[PDB]
Amino acid sequence: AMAAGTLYTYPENWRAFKALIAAQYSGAQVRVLSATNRTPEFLRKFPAGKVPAFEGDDGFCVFESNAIAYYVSNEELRGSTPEAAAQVVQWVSFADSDIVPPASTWVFPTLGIMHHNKQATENAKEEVRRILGLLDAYLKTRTFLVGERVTLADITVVCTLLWLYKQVLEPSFRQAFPNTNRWFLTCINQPQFRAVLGEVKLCEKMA
Amino acid sequence: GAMAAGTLYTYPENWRAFKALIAAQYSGAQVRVLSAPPHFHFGQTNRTPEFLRKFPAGKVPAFEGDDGFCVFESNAIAYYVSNEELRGSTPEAAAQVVQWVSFADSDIVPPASTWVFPTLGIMHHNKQATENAKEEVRRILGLLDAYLKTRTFLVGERVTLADITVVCTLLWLYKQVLEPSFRQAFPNTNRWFLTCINQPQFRAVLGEVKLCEKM
Amino acid sequence: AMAAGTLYTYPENWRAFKALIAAQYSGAQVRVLSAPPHFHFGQTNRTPEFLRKFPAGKVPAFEGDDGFCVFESNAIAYYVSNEELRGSTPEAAAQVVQWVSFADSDIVPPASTWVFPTLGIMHHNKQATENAKEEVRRILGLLDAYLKTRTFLVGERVTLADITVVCTLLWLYKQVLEPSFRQAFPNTNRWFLTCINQPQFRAVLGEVKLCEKMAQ
Amino acid sequence: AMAAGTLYTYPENWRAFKALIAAQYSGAQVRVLSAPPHFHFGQTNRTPEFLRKFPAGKVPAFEGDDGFCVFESNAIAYYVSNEELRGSTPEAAAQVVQWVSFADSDIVPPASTWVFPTLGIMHHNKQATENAKEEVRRILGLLDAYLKTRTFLVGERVTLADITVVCTLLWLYKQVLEPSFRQAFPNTNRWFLTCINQPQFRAVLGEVKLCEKMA
Amino acid sequence: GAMAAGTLYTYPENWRAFKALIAAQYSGAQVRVLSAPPHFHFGQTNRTPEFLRKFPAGKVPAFEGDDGFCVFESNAIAYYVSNEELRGSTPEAAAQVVQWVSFADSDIVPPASTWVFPTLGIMHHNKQATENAKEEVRRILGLLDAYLKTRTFLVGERVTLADITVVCTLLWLYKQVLEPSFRQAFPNTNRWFLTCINQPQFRAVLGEVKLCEKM
Amino acid sequence: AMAAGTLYTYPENWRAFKALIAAQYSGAQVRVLSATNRTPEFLRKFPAGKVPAFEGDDGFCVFESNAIAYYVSNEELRGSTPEAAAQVVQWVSFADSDIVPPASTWVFPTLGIMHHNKQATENAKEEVRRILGLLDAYLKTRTFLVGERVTLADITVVCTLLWLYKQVLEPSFRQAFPNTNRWFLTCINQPQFRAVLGEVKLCEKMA
Amino acid sequence: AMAAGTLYTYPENWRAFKALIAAQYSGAQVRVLSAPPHFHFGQTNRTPEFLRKFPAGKVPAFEGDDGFCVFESNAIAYYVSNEELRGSTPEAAAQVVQWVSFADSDIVPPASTWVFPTLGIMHHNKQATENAKEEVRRILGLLDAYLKTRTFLVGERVTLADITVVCTLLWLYKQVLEPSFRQAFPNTNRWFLTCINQPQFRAVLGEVKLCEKMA
Amino acid sequence: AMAAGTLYTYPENWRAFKALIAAQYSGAQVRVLSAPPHFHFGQTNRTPEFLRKFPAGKVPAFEGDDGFCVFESNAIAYYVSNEELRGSTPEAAAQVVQWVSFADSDIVPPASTWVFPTLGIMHHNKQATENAKEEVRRILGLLDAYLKTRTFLVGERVTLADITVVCTLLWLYKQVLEPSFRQAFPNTNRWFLTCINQPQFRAVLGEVKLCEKMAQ
Amino acid sequence: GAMATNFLAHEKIWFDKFKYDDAERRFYEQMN
Amino acid sequence: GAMATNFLAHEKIWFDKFKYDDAERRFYEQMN
């Protein structure tokens, strides 16, 4: 059977999105409860005091958005062979190490989460172009990142790119990456994705 | 697994490479190391076209299997050359392994690097780089200490990728800055760390490890 | 006469130290901006406003109170210096250029190759590292012979020659030149210690601890 | 009073050209020794006599008629110059130092990387050449903007600034800067062509043919 | 030369690779070894497309320089990582080096291989493979013996690629079949061979070499 | 100065051809004298008792066709850089190890030097096809094997292929290797080559 | 008297199909145990009880009702056959051994190499697959010539020869032998289609769909 | 009954030995052609005439005096055998197929992997070699347990089982199975020595010397 | 050389058989 | 990471300078 339990998080959290989308595919039953992340009981279950955090109905506890998404996934989203599973870890790790930092820097001043810094965002723009370009060459001949089907790899990389595409990747900026754009559009228009993300509108005019 | 065989591209004494090298000691996988340097072009570090063909992010460590399977990111490489036991034999164990691996990357690597090598952070205006990193590391060791109070290893009852990954992420700290008066507060974490690095599979890759003396 | 202005840099920049030590001797009034909001390394020096005045995009960068801009570290140290530091005569001035040039072309690359890994900046193979160690022995030996019957490099007084060469050797002496490695060059060691304990050097460098054991 | 002396170098050395061109302006009497029996590069400069005067044993090397010895091409050029070439004010002098240091730090390495294979000095690497081309594009563009409303780099007259930058750019313009490549830099090309056609430059460089088709 | 650096593709303990490895001990060149196996497909030995791209003959040893320069054939590799002294400092010495290298390949390699490993030749109807090869080797050692009567090394007065190549070609013979009663007749050749393999540059690659005992 | 001396050999020897062609390029003066390769004086100068053998006018002695060709060459035929020189050794070594054995086997029964063996020559044909094919891909974008000019590499490989092209590489057989054919034709039509080889006629009908 | 017994195997095992098809012809009563609780592959076959009877611990494994145990799929198929399937004369018997051994030595390895990636058993290597395709072309062509004027491989009736070769070819015909590929082998395709449509084959194999488009 | 014919092979072919030893027991008249002009390995077996009769292009290849052709080594050994060597009963015949099949699928590949480099035929890495050594220990141990209370593999007499397994182990025992490696398998060693000293084996194999020290 | 090449072409040893047998075993064991 | 990348982009150290100086020296020495 698949997992069933409670996911502690604030909504509008892209890290939580990864697990929720994954559960749409797997049929895991995941109840979302807001966050308390400093009370002894919470720290008892989730020592690091981070959200998202997952408690199974059988009492199993896990934290880190990657581990939670892994847990409520099925074998196909995880990678049904050791090669495919290693490629999943590969893209997940690349999203964390290479995409999250410049993505934050750029999209944060447009969502009010960080203050504007013109040159900081110009620097971030460049690093984002390199990442979009890398994905573009890779996806030139591929439907998805790993094998022939959506995996955690796509889910993870899409969610990490989600706010960029909504807020700042305006037409002229993204036009150099038609393959990345198509792959992104193909993912977010899946029922499983729309179920969590709703109807995503690609950026119109660089915010 | 035991059958994986391939070439690991990396410079020597790289803790990121150590993760896969140690995993392969457990699994039986045959991992050979090739240490070809990048090129330095006028401030820019570049790698060969053949390398970028297989590994487009241009990072090391990178792994090419003898059957041509390519994978990069130290975590994915270590995953690949591991067996089921190191990966986690059940979805529960496997998820716990992803948890500590992710925790290592997000929470331990940045202050560990900063405390051992503060120069770059100071240059980029992190004035109190050292004291800030030292406090984060203190918090991390304390977290591991409470967790390991009643456990031999992070997941289940034997070494997994969890232990391998967290140990490798802590390796420079324990060698270079974790003084006896500082580490004294974490006897649990110290015991687990010693129990790991003294196993022959860790020793084969790490050699003899001298813990930081009083500075 | 003397220079008065503002110097942009990241902190702990040996290239900036050259000018700041020179200013201690000359009396130049140099205001250092090395932290946000006034300077953010990797950001400020890439902005159009910065590039307008300092096209190379490098720091240290100097803007005089009168608007005079200078964008390379040897030139900034020259500008904030006085006539004695620059070289009083053409002979002395020539020798200053010689040693400044020697530091830039001969010392900086092996020094960087050896020291940057010990600081966590990058990695070099044991070939490049070994070639670097050998080049540095050659450099320290050249200096050692030169300083056998000299207090300082040029004209028996501190000039830009000493300031520049000392600043280019500073990380080496702190990080990797352990007693067993540096033993063969007593005149160079003596001259280095001599310079960095000058009141004008100490005012900028603070207390310097020589490598006790090679960083690896 | 202008320098008089001997310059040891192998022939066609751009580093030596800097001093020789400076001497055209200043009137210094610099005689070149560059051929056997007088100077045999690789032998003469490794003798104890030579090494006495020039400890690094490199060329160019200058020995004045009064015994005064200088090494490093920048110092030799400075010494055989006059005050105008060195920079008449502290402002001009500082700007000359600026461009001399820029030439060494920023121009020489990509210039060497691109040109040496075309001369058979180094094996050709395509990626290194490509990166060097783009670095040279950046440099020519920096100069182009700077020379927009300037005749020369410093104080509206030839100084060591122009002489040094021109000599470090000389092999590029001969070997690899074809018309279509350098077309983007009309101010730099204009300034370069102007300098090499000054009587004092031509006295040393002779007639220089700009790259027709890239080598 | 000293500056050459690159990756040598080969399986370990390959006498053909030993030629370049020993040469690099003399020259200072940095040669790292990568031992990735070929593929065996239904009786056919094949190598990867990337390998065949750089080395179309599909043979090892093969060498790729860190600047991308590719070369195959063990003699060419050893030539490349050598210096001028090992190659021959004069056309006379250089020609003598090509002479012994060529003589090694044409006249020594076939009977050496056959005597140490006669199985394949016997299978392909060379009934008296062993006795035939033994007589050819006897002739070869006798030729070297007369030549070395008055000489320390094959060419000039120091080790060249001549000695390195002939020693490597004789290495298995001296280890496996050249019994004291057989080799007794060639004290000159034996002395030269011992003088070579005991030098630190040979020792670094060959380790301690035990000569064939009575069988 | 270049070499001057006597070359001991029978004429019609392709191994000798390498040195003689090389001398055409270099301006070395090489007098050809027939062979005696078992007298004490010969063995005194040339211990291995092989021809070709070269004695310089100054008494310098060298054997092996590769070494002789090397000696009467100039720096450009030898390789004017260490990379080019290593490539020369490379092609020379490949000619000796890979081309000479199957070339002999096939062309020998058609020149009366060895007896016919149908399957032996069919096997040799195949190995020759692999070598011609390897040269064909290499020479697709190159005029000569090394650098931009004839070197010992071309001279050596041409001479090793010389008898095949004369005797057995008939049109239908060689048509698959247009680049190798053009390179071969380009070499043998050089003045230096024709001076030694005369007018080479490519095979008409597989002998 | 025909064999009666139990066959241990995982399900859909072509190696087991050989015995089961033979049993259709001979009338042997062979019952399959292939699912838990009775047979759990990877567990049941590693127990001391199983290993007592079948020391290699592999499947298929046959235990007769009289206690007689056989391993190796060829031996099991032989045992549950009748004399006609085994070959009625020494000539026919020898020809059956011939084709059974040919299937194992020549067909199984390229068949496995090509098919296993399409089933997710092995990672796909393009060069290995390409070489396996060409080896399968050679094999189909050998069979095609042999079956030109033969209905079956041996003695004009179904024997273990046909049963074994067909079972070793079965995954190829299902997974990768598309019409355009197999078109060159009309006699082999005819013989294969004929065999799998014999009542005894269909009883075991069911309806077999030939590869539409190559996997 | 019994077979009479000609056998083509390269000399010292263990696959040919199977049939030749079988013929010693049965009385089959087998003429061996293993040298030019009658057989040239790599040539004769590639000719159209050869391929006509022996489509696989392999040796040993057998043509009976009556024109009957057989082109695989197990089949040739079967054909030149008698009823006892083949297996008298279906039970025994089955066991013969078992061991013949076991030798082909389990013994030949690791044996080849380990032994071919020691013979100068190819190289294998120390991984493949180590896996091979381990597989061979597994095989010798399986045989050792099996032969604990058996003289021969099937029915207490030499069959094709012994002949085939002995021939597939022959190079291993000569080349690499040194006393310290083979010590753990006394029943296998005893059975091997027993078989190869049978008059019928010795007639084909001659004297066999067991490895004294592992070839490397 | 030619001899080793012929010998190996003739024998066609499946040196990689252990890799295939091991992958196959694992594949069918996991369907539980 | 980003910091080391910035620092190195700013400094532009010619780490390979010794290779170039050595090749150049050799080149001009050989014209004798």
CSV table of N, CA, C and O in Angstrom, one decimal, chain C residues 86-115:
chain,number,residue,atom,x,y,z
C,86,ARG,N,58.1,56.0,-4.5
C,86,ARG,CA,58.1,55.8,-6.0
C,86,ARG,C,59.5,55.6,-6.5
C,86,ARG,O,59.7,54.9,-7.5
C,87,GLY,N,60.5,56.1,-5.8
C,87,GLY,CA,61.8,56.1,-6.4
C,87,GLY,C,62.2,57.6,-6.7
C,87,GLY,O,61.8,58.1,-7.7
C,88,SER,N,63.2,58.1,-5.9
C,88,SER,CA,63.7,59.5,-6.0
C,88,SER,C,64.4,59.8,-7.3
C,88,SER,O,64.3,61.0,-7.7
C,89,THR,N,65.1,58.9,-7.8
C,89,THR,CA,65.9,59.1,-9.0
C,89,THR,C,65.3,58.1,-10.1
C,89,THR,O,64.6,57.2,-9.7
C,90,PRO,N,65.7,58.3,-11.3
C,90,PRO,CA,65.3,57.4,-12.4
C,90,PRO,C,65.9,56.0,-12.1
C,90,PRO,O,65.2,55.0,-12.4
C,91,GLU,N,67.1,55.9,-11.5
C,91,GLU,CA,67.6,54.6,-11.2
C,91,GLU,C,66.8,53.9,-10.2
C,91,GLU,O,66.5,52.7,-10.3
C,92,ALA,N,66.4,54.6,-9.1
C,92,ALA,CA,65.6,54.0,-8.1
C,92,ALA,C,64.2,53.7,-8.6
C,92,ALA,O,63.6,52.6,-8.3
C,93,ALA,N,63.6,54.6,-9.3
C,93,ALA,CA,62.3,54.5,-9.9
C,93,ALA,C,62.2,53.2,-10.8
C,93,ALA,O,61.3,52.4,-10.8
C,94,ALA,N,63.3,53.0,-11.6
C,94,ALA,CA,63.4,51.8,-12.4
C,94,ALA,C,63.4,50.6,-11.6
C,94,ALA,O,62.8,49.6,-12.0
C,95,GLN,N,64.1,50.6,-10.5
C,95,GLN,CA,64.2,49.4,-9.6
C,95,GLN,C,62.9,49.1,-9.0
C,95,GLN,O,62.5,47.9,-8.8
C,96,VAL,N,62.2,50.1,-8.6
C,96,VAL,CA,60.8,49.9,-8.1
C,96,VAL,C,59.9,49.2,-9.2
C,96,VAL,O,59.3,48.2,-8.9
C,97,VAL,N,60.0,49.7,-10.4
C,97,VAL,CA,59.2,49.1,-11.4
C,97,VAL,C,59.6,47.6,-11.6
C,97,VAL,O,58.7,46.7,-11.8
C,98,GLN,N,60.9,47.4,-11.5
C,98,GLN,CA,61.4,46.0,-11.7
C,98,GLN,C,60.8,45.0,-10.7
C,98,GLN,O,60.4,44.0,-11.0
C,99,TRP,N,60.9,45.4,-9.4
C,99,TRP,CA,60.4,44.6,-8.4
C,99,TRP,C,58.9,44.5,-8.4
C,99,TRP,O,58.3,43.4,-8.1
C,100,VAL,N,58.2,45.5,-8.7
C,100,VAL,CA,56.7,45.5,-8.8
C,100,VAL,C,56.3,44.5,-9.9
C,100,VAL,O,55.5,43.7,-9.7
C,101,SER,N,57.0,44.7,-11.0
C,101,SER,CA,56.8,43.8,-12.2
C,101,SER,C,57.2,42.3,-11.9
C,101,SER,O,56.4,41.4,-12.2
C,102,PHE,N,58.3,42.2,-11.1
C,102,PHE,CA,58.7,40.8,-10.7
C,102,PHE,C,57.6,40.1,-9.9
C,102,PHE,O,57.3,39.0,-10.1
C,103,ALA,N,57.1,40.9,-8.9
C,103,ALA,CA,56.0,40.3,-8.1
C,103,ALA,C,54.8,39.9,-8.9
C,103,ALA,O,54.3,38.8,-8.7
C,104,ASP,N,54.4,40.8,-9.8
C,104,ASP,CA,53.2,40.4,-10.6
C,104,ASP,C,53.4,39.2,-11.5
C,104,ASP,O,52.5,38.4,-11.6
C,105,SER,N,54.5,39.1,-12.2
C,105,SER,CA,54.7,38.1,-13.2
C,105,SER,C,55.3,36.8,-12.6
C,105,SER,O,55.0,35.7,-13.2
C,106,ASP,N,56.1,36.9,-11.6
C,106,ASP,CA,56.8,35.7,-11.1
C,106,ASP,C,56.2,35.2,-9.8
C,106,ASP,O,56.1,33.9,-9.6
C,107,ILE,N,55.8,36.0,-8.9
C,107,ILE,CA,55.3,35.6,-7.6
C,107,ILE,C,53.8,35.2,-7.6
C,107,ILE,O,53.5,34.1,-7.1
C,108,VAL,N,53.0,36.1,-8.1
C,108,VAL,CA,51.5,35.9,-7.9
C,108,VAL,C,51.0,34.5,-8.5
C,108,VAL,O,50.3,33.9,-7.8
C,109,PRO,N,51.5,34.1,-9.7
C,109,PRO,CA,50.9,32.8,-10.1
C,109,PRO,C,51.3,31.5,-9.3
C,109,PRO,O,50.3,30.8,-8.9
C,110,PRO,N,52.6,31.3,-9.1
C,110,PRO,CA,52.8,30.1,-8.2
C,110,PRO,C,52.2,30.3,-6.8
C,110,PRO,O,51.7,29.3,-6.2
C,111,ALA,N,52.3,31.5,-6.2
C,111,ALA,CA,51.8,31.8,-4.9
C,111,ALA,C,50.3,31.4,-4.8
C,111,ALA,O,49.9,30.7,-3.9
C,112,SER,N,49.6,31.8,-5.9
C,112,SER,CA,48.2,31.5,-6.0
C,112,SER,C,47.9,30.1,-6.1
C,112,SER,O,47.0,29.5,-5.5
C,113,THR,N,48.7,29.4,-7.0
C,113,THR,CA,48.5,28.0,-7.2
C,113,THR,C,48.7,27.2,-5.9
C,113,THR,O,47.9,26.3,-5.6
C,114,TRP,N,49.7,27.6,-5.1
C,114,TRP,CA,49.9,26.9,-3.8
C,114,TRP,C,48.9,27.2,-2.8
C,114,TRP,O,48.3,26.4,-2.1
C,115,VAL,N,48.6,28.5,-2.6
C,115,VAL,CA,47.9,29.0,-1.5
C,115,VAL,C,46.3,28.9,-1.6
C,115,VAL,O,45.6,28.5,-0.6
